[PDB]
Design an enzyme around this catalytic site. Sequence first.
Site, PDB file in Angstrom:
ATOM      1  N   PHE A 112       0.392  -0.866   0.025  1.00 41.19           N
ATOM      2  CA  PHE A 112      -0.313   0.218   0.237  1.00 41.19           C
ATOM      3  C   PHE A 112       0.516   1.098  -0.033  1.00 41.19           C
ATOM      4  CE2 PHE A 112      -4.641  -0.506  -0.167  1.00 41.19           C
ATOM      5  CZ  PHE A 112      -5.092  -1.346   0.522  1.00 41.19           C
ATOM      6  N   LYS A 116      -5.458 -10.177  -7.440  1.00 40.03           N
ATOM      7  CA  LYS A 116      -6.179 -11.208  -7.382  1.00 40.03           C
ATOM      8  C   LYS A 116      -5.437 -12.665  -6.927  1.00 40.03           C
ATOM      9  CE  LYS A 116      -9.887 -14.379  -7.064  1.00 40.03           C
ATOM     10  NZ  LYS A 116      -9.158 -15.254  -7.055  1.00 40.03           N
ATOM     11  N   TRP A 164     -14.122  -2.783   5.247  1.00 40.26           N
ATOM     12  CA  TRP A 164     -12.952  -1.685   5.230  1.00 40.26           C
ATOM     13  C   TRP A 164     -13.359  -0.555   4.428  1.00 40.26           C
ATOM     14  CZ3 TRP A 164      -8.862   0.362   2.460  1.00 40.26           C
ATOM     15  CH2 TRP A 164      -7.589   0.264   2.532  1.00 40.26           C
TER      16      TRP A 164
END
Lengths: 305, 304
Positions: free
Chosen positions: A75, A169, A296
């Site tokens: 991130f 994914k 989230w």
Amino acid sequence: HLEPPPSTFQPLCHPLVEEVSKEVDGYFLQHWNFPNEKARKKFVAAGFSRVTCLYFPKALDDRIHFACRLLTVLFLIDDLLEYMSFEEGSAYNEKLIPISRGDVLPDRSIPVEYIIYDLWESMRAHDREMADEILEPVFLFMRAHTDRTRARPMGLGGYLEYRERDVGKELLAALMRFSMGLKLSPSELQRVREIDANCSKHLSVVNDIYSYEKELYTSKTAHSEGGILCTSVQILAQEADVTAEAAKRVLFVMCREWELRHQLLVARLSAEGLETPGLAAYVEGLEYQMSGNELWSQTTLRYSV
Amino acid sequence: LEPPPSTFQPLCHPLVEEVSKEVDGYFLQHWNFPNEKARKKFVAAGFSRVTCLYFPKALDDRIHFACRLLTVLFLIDDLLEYMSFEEGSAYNEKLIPISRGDVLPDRSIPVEYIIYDLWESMRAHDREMADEILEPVFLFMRAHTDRTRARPMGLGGYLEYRERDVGKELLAALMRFSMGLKLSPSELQRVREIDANCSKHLSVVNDIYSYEKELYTSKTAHSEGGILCTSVQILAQEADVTAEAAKRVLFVMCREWELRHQLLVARLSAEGLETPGLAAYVEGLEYQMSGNELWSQTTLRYSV
Ligand SMILES: [Mg+2]
Ligand SMILES: [Mg+2]
Ligand SMILES: [Mg+2]
Ligand SMILES: [Mg+2]
């Protein structure tokens, strides 16, 4: 405000979420170079360990922290790429790839290098076989952020095919199996290809829906290449000639259809004599990813401010 | 299939029954129907009912013109689905000069003198407004044999094309003709964005309810003329979901277009731009959208 359409998915969070969050957030607050105090607080407010626990709620208790560390640094890296060009961004990623493999020693003066190095070293020390199965999906994820197809026009169809790599994914699939110690045969992995693809669309669009405002701001203030707007919200808004907010509501309905398809695909996989106990745990895990990603995204300060 | 809530309230022309029996009677008398089963199915479709739902505030002595035009277009388009792209093109192009009145019809060929007498009667009633329907109709007809239908299409590219295949422009011109509503070129330029938004609503709503019939046509009729060209199967392919799944998503999208319509009209009214003529026009478009949904919901053409 955006009201989510009814979902049968029950989101689950890992029981050790509070411990691992304090632990992993603490580590990055010690080692990572944040530009200021505001960035440090915004880092904690994001709850990068909280999304990881929502993604893999049934992860083994001594392997959940590995996942929290990996997603957190990824991130942080992707946020940095948005201020770089495709060329600068590619060089940044490719320098961390042999380090991730452990073939190249890190620069101890450079935080991102030894954080990446120590992480993968610690992961291979816990489970060498499963940790190695995460490498290429991660590299696929990273290299997708500098793919020059982001600078070319895309329809909804072509976008979803590309975003399967950009949303990571395959990375999330390998990470989940690693954190759970869930080993599957190549016959089992091939057996649920269609379930993976359907799950990927759900993860991508749900993210697009809630991260749109953040990405829209980035596209106006950051680099013209690294911060370029690449989302289903913008694409559907163009093609259907509606506001981005209208596209969100429509895309959210579509996500619920993918949830339905997930249930039917699993049912058909079970109707046929193809649902092994390992596969049942896998497709159940994929459901946790989809519902966990939504929870989230609905609540994190990363998207609301 | 449960439709999402809508603020649009449908209206029907008060002379719907009188005009229906008049127009249906005309075609049953002149049009070459193959058999009695086809004649019953023609009546069951309610082609004059949808016209009266499209233009509920049309003038009493002009509503029958609109019914005849839309009816004969439905009949022609059903014939095109059994033809190839080339055959359909030759069919349409033969009727276009006849529509203008430049070529006399073969009186032994029903479609030719029906087309001819219709446009001739419309020009006799209102010459100027009738001429303004010609080219929009031709654009509509030629769209049915456009070979873009046989090539891969995105949702955005489809809606742009379907604006012609749904006949948004001809419906607009027909509405104004039937109402006697005259608008200046500058006025029509003000509602261009509203028209485009309205076109998407008419197209997708029709796509949702007519999908089953068009699916059957694609499987039984000509591979070209009856080819499947709908947002239902397009969105289904792009999102990898079933046709019924796409319908539910497309219906939500339709309500957003209703929301945009109200927003665009309100903005048109905020600025001193909504003239009395435009006010009647934008209300007429809303009747088209609500009327199209009502008919598509209930017509035997799509249910059986
Ligand atoms: Mg991104
Ligand atoms: Mg995003
Ligand atoms: Mg058609
Ligand atoms: Mg249709």
